[PDB]
Design a binder for this molecule. Structure first.
Ligand SMILES: Cc1cc2nc3c(=O)[nH]c(=O)nc-3n(C[C@H](O)[C@H](O)[C@H](O)COP(=O)(O)OP(=O)(O)OC[C@H]3O[C@@H](n4cnc5c(N)ncnc54)[C@H](O)[C@@H]3O)c2cc1C
Ligand SMILES: Cc1cc2nc3c(=O)[nH]c(=O)nc-3n(C[C@H](O)[C@H](O)[C@H](O)COP(=O)(O)OP(=O)(O)OC[C@H]3O[C@@H](n4cnc5c(N)ncnc54)[C@H](O)[C@@H]3O)c2cc1C
Ligand SMILES: Cc1cc2nc3c(=O)[nH]c(=O)nc-3n(C[C@H](O)[C@H](O)[C@H](O)COP(=O)(O)OP(=O)(O)OC[C@H]3O[C@@H](n4cnc5c(N)ncnc54)[C@H](O)[C@@H]3O)c2cc1C
Ligand SMILES: Cc1cc2nc3c(=O)[nH]c(=O)nc-3n(C[C@H](O)[C@H](O)[C@H](O)COP(=O)(O)OP(=O)(O)OC[C@H]3O[C@@H](n4cnc5c(N)ncnc54)[C@H](O)[C@@H]3O)c2cc1C
Lengths: 227, 227, 227, 227
């Protein structure tokens, strides 16, 4: 059974200031937190600079001056489904995330194959075959601890096998993931995952992620770049 | 000027489930997130075990079975004031936190000195002296880039100099901090900081941090231990 | 083509003391480094305790007192071949290692399947099938950027596909890997990898890794435990 | 008592290839390791490109193509003395190092103060004063657990108090430390520490660290930059 990518933003930072701090801002949550952490460094809760007085303007300055460490206080959790095991192998290479993965048939078809009906059929026949071989092996094994027979038979399962993964990281880790994977260089499936995560995070925190440019490439696949 | 420790919980995880997941729980936020991440691993959104069906019971099981990695999805940010530079040096040794520290007179008196009026006066006279020496040096320097004269004169400032720090970490990092520092072994000031952070987190997430026992020791200082 | 696990220790720490430190020890390299770092903490280069004067005795004490952070200064690099992609996915979940993996036919047969000639043939026929499907797809694609056709066709490759990986970490990270994976709980393939890494490290640093007990289980698979 | 900065390279990576790999290179140790890890990724042990056949040329290419992750396999340990507690507080902010610090009178004089005999005397009189106050407090305390009286009296010790620290990290972590701290922006004392660490590492691994430019500034303080 063929499944498509699904990215859902399931967690985010909720911010509340200490009451005894003379400071307020034009935004709530993660982006207010980031501003708070910045002002906490220099004791600028009274906003002495008229240029960087607003949240959006404040966060934009943090960026240029390269104080991206401030981004580490804000957090986001994605629940990702419809991602292959091979793309998940790439995703877990990013070591500042925290993961909870589905303990290892639904399958993920590469879009270049999905776009050609005749290749798709050929692909799915190869998937059925893998699954037939898995069952034929698992039954041969269990015949003659039984977690051991399944973990052995799994060896036959394809890269395309769907995984599901909870992934948490701070905004700095997200920006780095997206910067590496959403660029045109990158593997197609992980690029799509990154663009989709970005899209969710551009909604959640428009200024932190605003500098990223989503373009549709000619092949209809999307990409993102930043200065 | 003498200041006391202040710990304020300024950020926490807000959780919202994907609509298309047949699962609900008896709690909101961080602890619901942790449960979600656990069920996501094994696809137990339908709750097949009557023992671990509730959130509190579910999280308690996670603990015993040692799946503490699930705790990494939940986050907490403290704003800490009234903490000495020496205690902050100990705090930043914990490398899975993210920090934003006040860029380096308010001072922190060790409680053993604070409890004796005559020692306290002796301590504060030593603090005034440090501050007199700081100014007398900074003025000698600036006389004959001027960020360089202050950073040189600072060399004379005591360990007791107050710092202020924004500190973020996931629940696993918090549990580890508290486990190491809230134990009787630990330095007094960092122990107090840990107990206070724990107290805030026991309010925020009673089951995750419930297993920690706060005792008052004989000297009136508090401690925390866990099995 | 079937390949077996190969673990090779390709890098280790070389230690040389500063000449101006009045200290010498009965061992060279990594374990001398660890002792040096310990004595550097407390200024015990002159060895005041007759019990913990020797390296082996010194390192054994570090262990009991739980100063395992001293182990972080010593490093080891393994080159691992004959490891499946699924076991490599488990290996890279350990986030304090550094990895360089073979950029993705040689295959790894699970030992439970390898031990039965008839299952093995069935397994290898499933491997040939995967490979036939890979080529038949890659040729269909390239017919009608060409890094994109291979990365799409790979989707069909099994978990068993051999990977090769350079893996570096400090002794603390190694001890943790081995502690989690070499225990009887663990997946068979990753357990074998861990035992083998341990065996190499027990040769390289006998006292650091000496407390780990390698037993052969009844099924002829090996295991390791520690107090 | 006044002490000066001392940086000593006490550990480095020793490399030995697996015998069964048809590959040799024109260098030993850390830089051969880095090349090995690169070739392991792409199976280029036979050197197909005449441009990047030598180690120095190979490592230089790794740099431009931004595969700096290869640098993580190589390790270096410094023993640093004559570093103030305030500079050590900055140093430990770099979270991918491993540290063993002297458990907290020798003092470190800021060079801007050291260069003026009259300021130096003023500084050292402030240091004697801090030390007199420390003893006068510790004796008042111990009069009326005794690790608690010293840790309280320490509160009075200045930033300038000498620390000693064992610091380990991989070449990537070193490059990042040096990149942030050796630049003209940076605090003077931590800049000097970074330049000195660089100087040691330029000897140890000339190609990995060769791109860093050490200039003497007008004030006689040194700096380092890289493209
Ligand atoms: C052109 C290119 C080709 C590559 N080819 C391969 C390949 O064939 N095989 C392969 O295995 N890898 C390859 N890599 C590297 C691999 O893609 C990355 O290592 C992986 O995606 C993890 O990302 P990261 O290294 O940025 O670190 P992450 O784990 O995402 O961490 C983010 C940042 O934190 C820092 N960091 C985290 N941990 C450490 C640490 N232990 N030491 C120092 N700094 C740390 C680094 O600054 C890093 O940039 C390649 C990279 C590039 C650019
Ligand atoms: C009795 C005792 C005495 C000590 N004395 C001294 C002393 O005199 N001087 C001194 O400098 N330190 C000393 N330490 C160690 C020091 O207290 C800790 O290193 C510091 O508090 C950081 O905590 P952590 O090591 O648990 O790691 P954290 O940085 O808090 O990380 C938490 C966990 O993540 C893991 N981790 C993080 N980074 C790495 C990594 N790079 N490699 C492997 N694992 C990692 C470890 O599992 C660690 O437990 C002592 C420790 C003990 C128990
Ligand atoms: C019974 C059991 C079942 C599990 N089931 C699943 C499952 O179904 N799916 C799944 O995805 N995972 C599962 N896990 C967890 C998974 O095996 C581990 O997360 C993975 O092996 C990485 O190991 P580690 O978590 O010890 O951390 P490593 O990355 O190996 O790091 C070593 C140590 O450093 C510290 N550390 C490193 N990074 C951080 C951080 N960001 N925050 C706080 N501390 C950190 C921790 O102390 C950690 O112990 C399970 C674990 C157990 C015990
Ligand atoms: C202009 C400027 C002003 C600053 N002012 C202040 C200040 O007033 N107060 C203050 O406290 N700090 C300040 N900082 C930040 C502080 O200097 C750094 O946070 C500190 O030196 C640690 O360095 P690092 O952040 O590069 O990370 P390191 O800990 O050195 O790690 C190296 C790299 O690994 C990655 N990394 C490691 N851990 C994580 C993580 N948890 N999440 C995501 N990525 C990670 C990052 O890519 C990082 O660049 C300032 C920074 C700049 C540029």
């Amino acid at each position: 059974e063929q499944v498509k990518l699904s990215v859902e933003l399931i967690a985010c930072s909720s911010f509340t200031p200490p009451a005894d701090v003379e400071w307020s801002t034009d935004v709530e949550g993660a982006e207010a937190l980031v501003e708070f952490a910045g002002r906490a460094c220099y004791e600028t809760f009274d906003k002495p600079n008229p240029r960087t007085a607003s949240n959006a303007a404040y966060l934009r300055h943090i960026m240029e001056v390269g104080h991206t460490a401030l981004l580490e206080h804000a957090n986001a959790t994605m629940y990702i489904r419809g991602i292959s095991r091979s793309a998940t192998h790439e995703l877990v290479r990013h070591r500042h995330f925290s993961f909870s993965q589905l303990s290892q048939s639904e399958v993920v078809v590469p879009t270049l194959i999905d776009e050609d009906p005749q290749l798709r059929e050929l692909f799915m026949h190869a998937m059925d075959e893998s699954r037939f071989a898995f069952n034929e092996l698992l039954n041969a094994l269990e015949e003659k601890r039984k977690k051991q027979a399944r973990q052995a038979a799994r060896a036959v399962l394809p890269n395309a096998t769907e995984s599901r993964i909870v992934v948490s990281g701070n905004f700095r880790t997200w920006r780095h993931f997206i910067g590496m994977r959403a660029s045109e260089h990158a593997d197609v499936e992980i690029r799509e995952v990154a663009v989709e995560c970005l899209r969710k995070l551009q909604v959640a925190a428009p200024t932190v992620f605003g500098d990223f440019e989503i373009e549709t490439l000619a092949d209809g696949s999307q990409m993102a770049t930043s200065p």
